[PDB]
Structure 1
């Protein structure tokens, strides 16, 4: 029923203005530009709005605390993040937030939700579908797959299928409106 959406920034939130300058959308706007109608009874919470390259270890302590104070209040959490360090964060959170009572799903995109053929809609739709499953823990949703967050690495830099589960089966893969086990 009840989903919390925490924003950290990244390419998913990106918008280039008419000038060298770079602007960021809030997590609420991302969802709406991605064209997500489903998400209902969904809250938003914008922790950061940076390129994930800037992430420091202190940023993780912030995120951990926030998550630890929301895990009882929600059935599912989604965290949108830049792809550059997405897997660093998901791994670290898995260690910090030892035993999560709910699914916590990290996602992002290689193409800003702004543009056409963005992978944002698929990623978010996937994250949300898994945030509402029964399955507690830390995960990455990307290119239609759900992967254990502490077994995920960025494997490609200029390509939709950017993340893989390493030496560990995919938790679930999308197949229409159905999340299939592995």
Structure 2
């Protein structure tokens, strides 16, 4: 009568006991995949998750991945692009310690299972479920350092709200995800090297130079305003792009697109505009574009479709 839901854990908090109400909604199995703080999240853990989900797809009805809040939005988007399973994959975390007063973890997990168990949640991409809300893996980001309500889809809004164990879904992401992407990670053991550099007044070119000297496959710029670059940084990246380094212009600004056709001649320089992808998200999609192409023009079209 109830769904089989697999909980993949990536850090701390067993739990069918800790949240006995899960037993009313699904049959939960749990697997510890890794045990890290999500500030140490890395390419290895990403590759492992995509493979496990892709491998175990026919063994369960849905997945819930328990993950730290810090880089949750990076992992969600990585999984969003590399997961080929059609069944729900829901990521979830907690803003407050397990043992703290009014800990958010218990109900978050419950709502995460609810979402993973809902047949209406399939084919919507990888999801993040926090604070009573279903959020798509592409647009979701953490907006506050301490607030329980931190997770928001700050450009295009949530897909659905959860009340009394039910979801009214009113949206679904248009950008292609999961089984509509060509990214296939099944045989990779490492990802292309992509770095992020910050722009601000009197910015040093040294961070950008250090990535170029290291032979990085790509560099994402956390630009100022609509993806602009401090002069030093621009000169160094203009050079990296003609030398075999893919360059993506994003923005430190927390909402809105870094657009083509603004102050930067992207085609003269061989640069790609990230659109609404923030820098860490642009990194994800740049690493994956680089397993398929090094051509700035092709990379730009990937940035326009996923």
Deviation at 1:177, TM superposition (A): 3.0
Q: Which has the higher contact order (CA 8 A, sep 6+)?
A: 1
Tell me if 1:131 matches 2:116.
yes
Residues in 2 aligned to 1:160 and 1:36: alpha-carbon distance in whole angstroms = 21
What is the aligned-residue RMSD (CA, Å)? 1.6
* Aligned counterparts of 2:9 and 2:134: Cα–Cα separation in 1: 19
Contact 1:35–1:121 (Cα < 8 Å) also in 2: no
Out of 21, 27, 50, the residue aligned to residue 41 of structure 1 is 27
Residues 34-64 of structure 1 show CA distances to partners (whole Å, capped at 9, x for unaligned) of: 4444354211110112110011112100111
For structure 2, the residue ranges without an aligned partner over 5 or more in a row are 171-306
Residue 6 of structure 1 contacts residue 46 of structure 1 at CA under 8 Å; is this kept in 2?
yes
The number of residues matched between the two structures is: 164
| Unaligned ranges ≥5, structure 1 | 14-27
Distance 1:122 1:131 in 2: 14
Task: Spell out, residue by residue over 1:46-99, the C-alpha distance to the aligned partner (whole angstroms, 9 max, x if none).
Answer: 0112110011112100111111111121111000000000110000111111x4
Q: 2:139 — aligned with what?
A: 151
Aligned twin of 1:25: none
Is the 2:53–2:85 Cα contact (8 Å) retained in structure 1? no
1:156–1:162 CA contact under 8 A, matched in 2: yes
Q: Is residue 66 of structure 2 the alignment partner of residue 66 of structure 1?
A: no
Under a length normalisation based on structure 1, what TM-score does the superposition of the two structures give?
A: 0.83
The alignment status of 1:88 with 2:74, answered yes or no, reads yes
Are 1:103 and 2:88 an aligned pair? yes
**Structure (1 or 2) with the greater strand fraction:** 1
Which protein is bigger by CA-based radius of gyration? 2
- Structure 1 moving runs of 4+ over 4 Å: none
